[PDB]
Scaffold this active site. Sequence first.
Site: not given
Length: 485
Positions: A385, A419-424, A466
């Site tokens: 997580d 993923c979620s934001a698409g960056i990390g 990130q």
Amino acid sequence: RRWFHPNITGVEAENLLLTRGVDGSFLARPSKSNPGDFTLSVRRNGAVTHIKIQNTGDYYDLYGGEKFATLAELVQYYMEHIELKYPLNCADPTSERWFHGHLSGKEAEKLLTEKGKHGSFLVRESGDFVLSVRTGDSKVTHVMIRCQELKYDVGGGERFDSLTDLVEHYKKNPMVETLGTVLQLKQPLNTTRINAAEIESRVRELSKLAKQGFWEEFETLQQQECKLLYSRKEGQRQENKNKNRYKNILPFDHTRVVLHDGDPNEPVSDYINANIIMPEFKPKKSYIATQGCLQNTVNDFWRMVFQENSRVIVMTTKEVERGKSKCVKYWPDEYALKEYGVMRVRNVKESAAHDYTLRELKLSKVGQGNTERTVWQYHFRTWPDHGVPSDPGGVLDFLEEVHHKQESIMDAGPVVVHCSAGIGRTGTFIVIDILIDIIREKGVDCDIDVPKTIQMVRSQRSGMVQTEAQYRFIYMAVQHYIETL
Ligand SMILES: CC1(N)CCN(c2cnc(-c3cccc(Cl)c3Cl)c(N)n2)CC1
């Protein structure tokens, strides 16, 4: 990006703002109370406020503010919108590309001779410093930098408040030797490019105390993020606002995926929060880095996959994490068929593996049978997580399978990663994939430059990779891949 101070405590920050700043002065720094976190220290009505910024790997989350892709994007947002008026500039050269603190003159000449070219330079400690420049097709020149009464100079002329100001001045106004040689400071000496075979040695050196070498290298890379403030106008349009998972995490206009053949009755049907990522910047070994679908963007997502001829999707998040929706379910249940606007998807079969699930999907456009293609969705389900996996083995075995699937498909479009934001996590998987692909084609005897690769990916989507934890994970994954060859 001079408002970022990498080595100060909260007390030093308060004393800096109260003595050298004014109301509206601010700076950002890494946290000492919780390493991995950041603090924005702001002066307001003669007092200092410390604001927490957290990043567990998906985005920078500012307390009492919004979620951002980079600290530079955060600062630009508030400076163009507690008031952030005056950056309090850092004089510390630790995160400069050309600064090599305690390094000897013998070693510095060895590095410029073996790895330098015309205009390669470095600055090293002598309280004084030495500027060493290579010129030619060749020779090394050493310029003594005196530190007299807290200011810096090369023995005459101007006196600078920092090594940064001195280097910037002599980059603009080069020193000329009395016989004609222009001491051109063209580029910092490259010390991060390594032979893939020597990855273990570099990881060992980076794991030593500088916070470790990894921290220093990652923060020198972050310092360069102010070079990447490209326009994101399309994502800011009123019509596109609710198509973004996070209001301020947007695709650069110059690389965004533009959606064609939209509903003629829909004024704005060309947007998706996604960017094409090209290695060394073919559709095949390219990627699309995107966010986790929202309920209102599922149809746009499938228009994107179809239009781009993508045959492989990599999902690196669960649908729900820590009780929050990270990605809506954009695919049908096993054996079901669904229509998502003009796109029709059948879930042919699901296969469970230790770390992931594979979903074999058939995508076609409604009313056109002959448009059907298989799309293979690799759903990585075990990423923690917060932070990164303790071992890269699972991620590598997963990427190996994704790579072979994509390679087996004639004229497959870019691999979609989200993923979620698409960056990390997305940026982490893409970077690992790019680096391992170089070791696949060119072999163990190839040059790899981790921060160069990441800066290249970050120029195509904001904040790809990130955290320092992900940065280290990328080195650990490359190491593990080479160790099992
Ligand atoms: C000892 C030191 N102060 C920290 C390590 N170091 C460097 C140098 N260069 C990069 C680099 C490489 C490629 C692209 C980009 Cl954008 C960057 Cl910034 C980097 N990440 N660290 C040398 C100076």
